[PDB]
Design a protein around this ligand. Structure first.
Ligand SMILES: [Cl-]
Lengths: 235, 242
């Protein structure tokens, strides 16, 4: 095909193990997630993948997964661009909560909406929340305007802020023939998947992308996939 | 105190104990150089340093030093800019050789001239050299013009291609009040120290920049240092640097 694009969701995080909604909280990789990232990088190495530029979020689970992949493929010299627009969805006031206890307190129907719905946001992260200053006052977001800084996001919201970056910064690299690697998060990667494949809201709601596994797209000149996404790794 | 600038030479590389000229060969950190970078990162975390943008070379020994520092200070999210203009000197045909070997091949006379001189380059790395294709045809230098791509560099040549990047790319960030960290190499950092401190050619060649130790400058509004460089670390590290 004209273009090759590779996506990778971060390896397993420390809050993935604690069973807590992370969102914008900056959880690090677990030791297993570090091994998953090292596996995905080895798979790309074995397949002889070359990139020209990498994009990632401002969240260390994604950045570290990128790093681990670039060390595995011996391409640590590549230019890397970070943007909050590739962040995980902002889980709002759910951030830090245990997911089982949240289902216990709110019931299955409400937590299913928050987790799996396309356009219902979680409750806002207000100033009394224990991660308010940790996240909303983090200086990595100093340059967002008041309207850009979310207190919560639905999946639709997350896509609405990820796609302008895809269109303004990523697509021009792809049309140059530069080979792009994007290391990010399930929900921001889903914006790109949905957009590349023209998926409906119901179909994007059903797709889950595994942590730490390279996803390869072969795109034609209109940046439309010429075949289904392929995962890289052993059997 | 208009501005705070932090420079760090890469932690000790795998070739240092072999006294071998790595140059543009992409050697990694040694175990000890990774510990140096970790200690520098912990020294910066404990002094509470915050940065807004980082610059580094295209060589892994410097990039890994930066990643280790940023992990330690929990600032992995900062923007990082890599450039070949902050690379180590290109040692030309001397790349890959140790000092004994450079003398056997080139003779003591030329070897001492290349070692002592600010502006006599080493011999070029020609198509028969073991590292020719490895460096010259590495994709990371593919954007350089035929004239930009060095085959060998004196220290003057290295300073000549690093200072434009300092003047064009880094100075403007410092004047916008961005707190800069530069993780690079002894010889490219020499360009910056020479320039900041107005040092002579002889003084910049004698100046040791230790591996892996954060070097803090406080600059006035003209980017001139208000005091000597500060080596940042614990007593043992500072005592070895001093
Ligand atoms: Cl980076």
């Amino acid at each position: 095909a004209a273009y090759k694009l590779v996506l990778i969701r971060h390896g397993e995080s420390a809050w993935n193990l604690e069973n807590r909604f992370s969102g914008w909280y900056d959880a690090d990789l677990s030791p297993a997630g570090h091994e998953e990232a090292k596996r995905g990088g080895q798979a790309l190495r074995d397949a002889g993948y070359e990139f020209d530029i990498c994009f990632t979020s401002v969240q260390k689970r994604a950045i570290r997964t990128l790093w681990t992949v670039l060390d595995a493929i011996d391409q640590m010299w590549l230019p890397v661009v970070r943007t909050w627009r590739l962040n995980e969805r902002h889980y709002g006031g759910l951030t830090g909560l245990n997911k089982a206890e949240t289902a216990a307190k709110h019931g299955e129907a409400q937590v299913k909406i928050w987790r799996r719905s396309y356009d219902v946001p979680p409750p806002p992260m207000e100033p009394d929340h224990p991660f308010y200053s940790n996240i909303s006052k983090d200086r990595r977001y100093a340059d967002l305007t008041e309207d850009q800084l979310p207190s919560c996001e639905s999946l639709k919201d997350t896509i609405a802020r990820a796609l302008p970056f895809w269109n303004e910064e990523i697509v021009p690299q792809i049309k140059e023939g530069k080979r792009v690697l994007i290391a990010a998060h399930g929900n921001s990667l889903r914006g790109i998947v949905k957009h590349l494949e023209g998926l409906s809201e119901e179909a994007i709601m059903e797709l889950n992308l595994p942590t730490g596994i390279p996803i390869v797209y072969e795109l034609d000149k209109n940046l439309k996939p010429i075949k289904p996404m392929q995962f890289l790794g052993d059997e």
